[PDB]
């Protein structure tokens, strides 16, 4: 799912000194069915033992779209722009 | 695509009556092409009024619309000659925006061009002029005039309202010009002749013997004032403290014109009409 | 000739009778021998200039300025007005006023305030309405220019419609002031040229008695507008010094600046238009005229045409001379004393583990620098990281002023260790940078 | 980074019955260096404790190529196509 | 660029009278267009040698050249008018085949329009044929030969190697025709015509009185066989037990010529030549 | 007229003497009159059908077919053949034989082995080789066509080079048939025409003696080729029965095949050509030629160009006669018994809940299958989901033959519960199925 929350431009740890707001959306929840054939190998490869599975992973949930891109002017009068900065369409990827 | 008052002519180049009909236009009337001062027609004013009237019925007597960006002096020339001649307010404008679909897109694709990544690095200026004319007529009034003309109380709500238009690229120049030629120079260009017109003309007196507007003149003087951001003819606070405004220009070496220089500058330095629908929009 | 007014002003009602006289208006000259000549423009106009109708009921006279009514203005004619005025209430209407074959100084405006009425009773005037117009005339008179009639007191349509009321006037204050208003005369006169190096604005009291006798008074003041009363000085006065490399070519090479101001009004012609030029130049040659300066930009900063050769001489007069017609010449000179005496370079390559004598001969600049500039008489040195800075003397450019760029002995250098180098080439004459400074590369292993 | 094995397709545990054989390739590895300004975001939210972090999580190993299809016969004499069934690139997405 | 024979033969076509030569010269010499044992002129031998003679001076007898790519068979037709003329085997190849990304891209390539989804749907047959030409065409013959020349011990392996062209789409039609009558199809196109006559020439017998061919003509037997699948000729083994190979066509009908149509099916279903060659690639 | 042959054989040296002979040709006769008349091709043939040289060597009788030396062939001469092979080692070489203005039966090869050296000794030749080609000659004789001379049996060029040998023939085993050798013969004759019905084949047994006396025999295969000796049966006689549809129109309707097979043999133009068509149709009307059947297919079954109409009557006559020609004509006859009597349809819409009188009419295909297929003497049903399976009568379509399809009181229907209905819709002329099923589609919504 796609969700959304209100909140201030240092909230976001990005080393910014402003007092400007934002809506932030982001890409949460459980997604790991094995949607194709690739992650139906990897589900039965580690069933079956083959694997051995060091860091080998399925499908997560990551943003597939992006939003606009936001502005702000900080306490020392200089302008900055955030992109690729909050999800607007959420898949398993 | 619709070029206005140039495309216009194009059809009537098209027939044979209208180009005659036209040509005769110009040659007996002087349209603008002299000083009005002057405005000795060519030949005589009957010659100049009859074939004004052969005009009447074919494609031309056009209006000169703004669309015509690259040649807007071209469109202008035509058309003319016809027709004459920290918590603030500032704050709050931003937290707005920024939570709006519109705005958000909007000021960010307009701070995008104007800014610099770099300390000597300079802005496209075209590009930074564009994206400011797009923001004023995208964005609803409601949070484009907030950015622009809210009230302040300290420097930082002062300091922020000064930056909306990112003066450093949209504003500031290298030399500050004479405002009488910069004037001149505004009226070549068809988007800026357009814009500095209606800014005459909504943000002037009342009418009577006061140097005061009414608030039913307010909405449109505003408007008017917006429009002139992005043009030759950018206007600024000029300050970190007044409400007090102008162009990149000044009043030196006016010569035997200097009252002129003045009494134009003044229009943005001193406007009490302006004065009053800035402060009427974040006030009461 | 000049109007003395910009802007004249009465009052127009109802159903004044044809042949009421208004007012008049006054030119003064620029030159002796100059006569006004009036005339109207062709219509009356209404509230911000709109264009009303023709002006079919005002004359003047040609002569003598007077405006008049040659047909009476009733309720239809003011309806007639009236309804072209663009929706504004008809308060005010005026008249161009030109005084040849609408700005100051060649044309005047005359604006009439229209009163719905009749004109009042005589007997309801008080002298203040009586004696003056509603607001004060302000006057203008050009400097250094022949004096004469710039105003005339009585109010027309009251002496016209109330003859029974007597009316006189005079100026207080003008004591060995240019300014003559004569017993029982009703206008004033300059006397004697003005000069706003004098005086620049004058407000004389002007005296009207009406009548039993009551008096009212109004300032009186007149602004002095300019005369080429003065001359312009070159604040260097002679620039006995100015330097110019010797023989150095170049579009423009600019020798120097000298400046002149002038003490008259800036926005006045005669102190602003100042002009540059150079009368002399000796001696003759070699070029005759090697030298040129900005005569507008005021910039007037000498600039040469030609080259320049070892101390030949050099002495410059300069004029300021505001203009060929009656302006002040003044001059300053100045003695040019010659001083006596092109695409980027690539990235070399050096061949790690290199070895053969000490000495690697690499490139050489000073054969650019001296091939560009023309001289030699210009010190070498070479900055950054293997030179002058860290790992210290690996690159070293030469006690001999030759400008070649050598490597030296660092054990024949190392690709493991560093493997790029980046230096910064200096040119400068006794002390001074006649250069840029070149950014050099070195790249440290084979092939290319 | 990407990784191979050997495998016969019955070890695929995809429901067929054959001898063939094929070349299986998967991403597989720590990959979570909060690369982009998003993926910054969501270590600072909950770092300050901001989000919550019901089910959020970051970049992952995943592939961004596929090899070519892979052919087989099974004991049954019927053909069958494996498409996007093995990874050519990796990266984190 | 250079045409060759065809863009002789336009040049000729350009002129009446070398047009009329040619003409005369197919209505009366057989060229190649009969068998060679047959060689009965269309008219008579009197009349083809005159209509020979008669080329000469004209633009006409050319000599062809390989330049036509596209059309090498229509150039080929002419000039020769005037020249002449489980474990098992199989599984280890389908193993190798998909190790290897030459083979596994090319056999899925294939693979892939010769199937269908569903039971009675049906494969584009002119998409399978393209793409198995494309399939040996590109695959080196040490894993496209394995394939398709395995030897086997059993009716798993067998039912393999039958299967490798997809024989239900490739092979296979509602009804069998008449192998002369497929003969002239296939010699009206150029690719079907090009890959049958090197099947002729590379898999006949040793050219002495015995009907076998040597060791030396193997490979080449082999890749003509090869050739010969994905064209209207396309051959497959005819059951699950021998090596015994034929088009899809017999011989019912023949009418007077059924000595022929034996003659040409038995040079598939009981060439020796072949069955060697098939049977040294995968056994020795 | 046909070679007896289609291939014939001897050997030739080198430096064998202009003259001598070779062997003999023989054509039989296709008809009484026909008299050959032989000529050689322009060319000798080589390995592989080569073409080798003109043949500057070997003549033939043009009456008589026998072939000879016109010239020796001496080293030189095999050499320019031998250069001219291709590359192939020269061990044959062969020449066409016509028997009119190569295959048979109206050409026939003659294949000589070459023998590097010259013909042998005499008293070095073995009786095998004094008697009889290397392999035995076989022989073609037509069925049904006149008898004649069809072989010679002596060796020409050892009775030319070895003429003190004395050689005879005979045949065994022909008693009763029709061959021919006569005492002191060397040829080889039929009698009287064969047939393939009585003998396909003859396999004789040659003899030669040789001198003292030394006997060698081979066979003497002869097969015969095919006459039109027999006629064609139809299987199906008198086809009493045979069925349409009454008036039903179309391109050809197939009313019914019949029939036949000829005896003889298919690869025979006697058996296999069959041709069938219909002699004649009584009655006349309404149309005289109501029906046609595909002669050459075979599949000869009879088709209607026109329509039919209830019991009028039809009687045809069907002739297989193999040709206008000397073919053999037979008949058989067919009675045909008259049987007396487009774009798919859209998604039907009801809206949920619906009340109002039972029976709600939806829609009627009666009016469409009577119409397309002209009958109203079909049963009309409907199966699946609604109607006859699951939830069963909700959709009903009439125990009156109508074809009007309806919705009954399922109290109205639910849109949840069912919210689509599919429904197939059958015709059955009398247990038959005449169409194909439709299916139906019904939606449970409002609007559309
Ligand atoms: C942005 O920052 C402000 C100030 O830090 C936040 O306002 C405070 O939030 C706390 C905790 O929820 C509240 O209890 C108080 O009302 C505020 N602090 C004080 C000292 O009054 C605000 O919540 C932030 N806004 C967003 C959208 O993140
Ligand atoms: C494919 O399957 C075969 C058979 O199951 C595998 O061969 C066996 O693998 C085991 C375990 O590694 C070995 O000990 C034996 O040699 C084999 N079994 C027997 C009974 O002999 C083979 O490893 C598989 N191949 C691939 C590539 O996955
Ligand atoms: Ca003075
Ligand atoms: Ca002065
Ligand atoms: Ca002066
Ligand atoms: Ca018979
Ligand atoms: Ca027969
Ligand atoms: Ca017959």
Redesign the interface.
């Given at each position: 799912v796609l969700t959304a929350i209100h909140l201030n431009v240092t909230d976001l740890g990005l080393g910014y000194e402003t007092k400007e707001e934002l809506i932030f959306r982001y890409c949460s929840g459980s997604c790991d069915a094995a949607e194709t054939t690739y992650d139906k190998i990897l589900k039965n490869l580690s069933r079956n033992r083959r694997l051995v599975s060091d860091k080998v992973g399925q499908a997560c949930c990551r943003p597939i779209a992006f939003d606009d891109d936001l502005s702000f002017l900080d306490d020392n009068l200089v302008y900055h722009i955030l992109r690729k900065h909050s999800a607007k369409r959420c898949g398993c990827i | 695509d619709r070029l206005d008052c140039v495309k216009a002519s194009d059809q009537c180049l098209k027939e044979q009556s209208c180009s005659t009909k036209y040509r005769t236009l110009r040659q007996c009337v002087a349209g603008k092409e002299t000083n009005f001062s002057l405005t000795s027609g060519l030949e005589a004013k009957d010659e100049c009024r009859s074939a004004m009237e052969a005009l009447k019925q074919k494609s031309l007597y056009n209006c000169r619309c703004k669309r015509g960006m690259k040649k807007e002096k071209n469109c202008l020339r035509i058309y003319w000659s016809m027709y004459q001649s920290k918590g603030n307010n500032c704050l709050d404008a931003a937290k707005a925006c920024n939570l709006d679909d519109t705005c958000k897109k909007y000021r960010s694709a307009y701070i995008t061009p104007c800014t610099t990544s770099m300390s000597n690095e300079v802005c496209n200026r075209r590009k930074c002029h564009k994206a400011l004319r797009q923001f004023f007529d995208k964005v609803p009034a409601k949070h484009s005039y907030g950015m622009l003309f809210c009230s302040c109380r300290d420097i930082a709500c002062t300091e922020r309202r000064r930056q909306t238009i990112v003066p450093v690229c949209s504003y500031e120049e290298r030399e500050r010009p004479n405002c009488l030629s910069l004037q001149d120079s505004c009226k070549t260009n068809y988007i800026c002749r357009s814009r500095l017109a209606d800014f005459f003309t909504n943000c002037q007196p009342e009418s009577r013997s006061v140097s005061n507007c009414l608030k039913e003149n307010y909405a449109d003087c505003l408007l008017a004032y917006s429009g002139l951001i992005g043009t030759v003819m950018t206007p600024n606070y000029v300050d970190s403290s007044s409400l007090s405004v102008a162009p990149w220009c000044d009043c030196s070496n006016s010569g035997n014109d200097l009252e002129d220089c003045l009494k134009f500058l003044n229009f943005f330095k001193d406007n009490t009409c302006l004065k009053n629908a800035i402060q009427a929009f974040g006030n009461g | 000739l000049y109007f003395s007014r910009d802007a004249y002003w009465e009052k127009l009602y109802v159903d004044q009778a044809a042949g009421t006289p208004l007012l008049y208006v006054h030119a003064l000259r620029d030159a002796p021998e100059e006569v006004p000549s009036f005339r109207l423009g062709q219509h009356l106009y209404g509230?911000?200039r709109t264009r009303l109708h023709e002006n079919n009921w005002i004359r003047i006279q040609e002569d003598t300025g007077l405006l008049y009514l040659q047909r009476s203005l009733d309720h239809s004619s003011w309806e007639k007005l009236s309804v072209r005025n663009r929706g504004?209430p008809l308060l005010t209407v005026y008249l161009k006023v030109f005084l040849s074959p609408?700005?100051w100084p060649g044309?005047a405006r005359v604006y009439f305030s229209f009163f719905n009425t009749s004109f009042p009773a005589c007997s309801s005037l008080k002298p203040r309405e009586l004696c003056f117009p509603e607001t004060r005339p302000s006057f203008r008179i050009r400097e250094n220019r022949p004096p004469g009639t710039f105003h005339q007191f009585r109010l027309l349509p009251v002496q016209f419609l109330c003859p029974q009321i007597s009316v006189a006037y005079r100026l207080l204050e003008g004591e060995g002031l240019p300014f003559r208003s004569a017993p029982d005369s009703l206008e004033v006169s300059t006397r004697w040229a003005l000069d706003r190096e004098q005086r620049e604005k004058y407000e004389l009291v002007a005296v009207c008695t009406v009548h039993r006798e009551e008096v009212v008074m109004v300032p009186f003041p007149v602004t002095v507008y300019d005369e080429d009363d003065s001359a312009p000085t070159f604040p260097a006065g002679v620039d006995t010094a100015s330097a110019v490399v010797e023989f150095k070519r170049k579009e423009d090479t600019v020798v120097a600046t000298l400046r002149v101001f002038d003490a008259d009004v800036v926005?006045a012609?005669g102190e602003?238009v100042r002009r540059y030029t150079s009368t002399l130049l000796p001696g003759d040659t070699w070029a005759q005229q090697t030298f040129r300066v900005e005569h507008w930009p005021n910039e007037t900063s000498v600039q040469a045409n030609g080259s320049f050769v070892r101390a030949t001489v050099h002495d410059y007069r300069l004029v300021l001379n505001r203009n060929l017609s009656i302006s002040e010449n003044r001059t300053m000179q100045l003695a040019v004393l010659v001083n006596d005496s092109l695409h980027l370079p690539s990235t070399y390559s050096l061949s790690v583990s290199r070895r053969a004598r000490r000495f690697a001969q690499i490139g050489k600049v000073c054969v650019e620098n001296c091939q560009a500039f023309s001289g030699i008489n210009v010190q070498y040195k070479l900055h950054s990281s293997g030179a002058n800075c860290s790992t210290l003397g690996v690159v070293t450019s030469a006690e001999d002023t030759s400008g070649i760029l050598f490597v030296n002995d660092t054990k024949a250098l190392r690709r493991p260790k560093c493997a790029e180098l980046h230096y910064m080439v200096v040119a400068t004459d006794q002390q001074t940078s006649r250069q840029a400074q070149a950014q050099l590369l070195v790249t440290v292993e084979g092939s290319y």
């Open positions: - | - | 509230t911000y504004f609408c700005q044309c926005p012609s602003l």
